[PDB]
């Protein structure tokens, strides 16, 4: 049975009895930087099991009127164990990441989520005449959510779902590494993202390599007396984490 699967990274292990295979980035699997592609001359540090493990973020509640959510990495993991510590003390970073979104219900509930990883998910502002604030793009492990209607915020992100806050069609986000969580068949979604960037390495605070978006295309629904609380938890584990440029920790 390919339904059941097990994931093991570091001192963490995830279990599943209702998965749907595993999407591996753009056909590639996380790998350390090679010598014929490196730029930083200093010998990198590789904490390995210390940083490459499963980090669970704050759960989110899926409601009949939920429009979606989104996280930005590696920023969202700035306060996660040693992975966040290396981000502070190092100028350059490089990691893989294994996204694992969980969400279970019952054979009597219905709904369908879209777990996607969007590289360089540059987003727009609510007020097209103004700019956006980092605080409105990503706020730690705290998820930002999409709205079923237009937003008005000064420096807020245009959370209107239909445009995914990028000025595009949500139905075309399938062009990015993704999976769906169709409650009647699924229970979770896993995506192994390889380091994608136009540079061997990059800062992890200044640059948001990719954005994880969970947009429901099939509204959550159910009958009376059926558990109304359906949470959606996101777990991610860095892979082949390398760091360069060691210096005094950065004051957030």
């Amino acid at each position: 049975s390919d339904r059941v699967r097990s994931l093991t990274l570091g001192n963490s292990t995830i279990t599943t009895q209702e998965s749907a295979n595993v999407v591996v980035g753009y056909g590639r699997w996380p790998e350390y930087l090679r010598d014929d592609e490196a730029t930083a001359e200093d010998q990198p540090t590789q904490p390995d099991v210390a940083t490459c493990r499963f980090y669970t973020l704050e759960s989110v509640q899926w409601e009949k009127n939920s429009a979606g959510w989104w996280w930005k990495f590696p920023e969202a993991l700035k306060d996660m164990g040693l992975f966040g510590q290396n981000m502070l003390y190092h100028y350059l970073g490089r990691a893989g990441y294994t996204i694992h979104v969980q969400c279970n219900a019952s054979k009597f509930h219905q709904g369908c989520l879209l777990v996607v990883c969007v590289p360089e998910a540059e987003m727009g502002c609510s007020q097209t005449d103004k700019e956006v604030a980092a605080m409105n793009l990503t706020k730690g492990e705290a998820a930002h959510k999409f709205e079923p209607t237009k937003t008005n915020g000064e420096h807020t992100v245009q959370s209107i779902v239909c445009n995914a806050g990028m000025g595009v069609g949500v139905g075309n986000l399938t062009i990015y590494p993704h999976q769906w969580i169709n409650l009647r068949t699924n229970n979770c979604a896993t995506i192994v993202m390889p380091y994608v960037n136009s540079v061997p390495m990059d800062n992890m605070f200044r640059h948001y390599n990719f954005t994880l978006m969970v947009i429901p295309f099939a509204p959550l629904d159910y009958a009376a007396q059926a558990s109304e609380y359906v949470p959606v938890t996101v777990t991610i584990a860095p892979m082949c984490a390398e760091y360069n440029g060691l210096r005094l920790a950065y004051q957030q």
Binding site: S1, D2, R3, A20, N21, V22, V23, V24, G25, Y26, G27, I175, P177, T185, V192
Partner: protein
């Protein structure tokens, strides 16, 4: 010279169809476009799964 004969794109009188080329400049950036590179691998986007899925079989089992 360093002439290099290639094949031309089919004409409206098919079913001497080759051209000659020589680079005159020292920089590769000066050369003409590579309109004849026909490589493909949709797998990256259409089948980026870890476990090979056989068409004639159930996606899940």
């Amino acid at each position: 010279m360093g002439a290099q004969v290639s094949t031309q794109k089919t004409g409206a009188h098919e079913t001497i169809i080759h051209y000659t080329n020589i680079n005159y400049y020292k920089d590769a950036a000066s050369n003409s476009a590579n309109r004849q590179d026909f490589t493909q691998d949709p797998g990256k986007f259409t089948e980026p799964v870890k476990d090979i899925m056989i068409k004639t079989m159930p996606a899940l089992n």
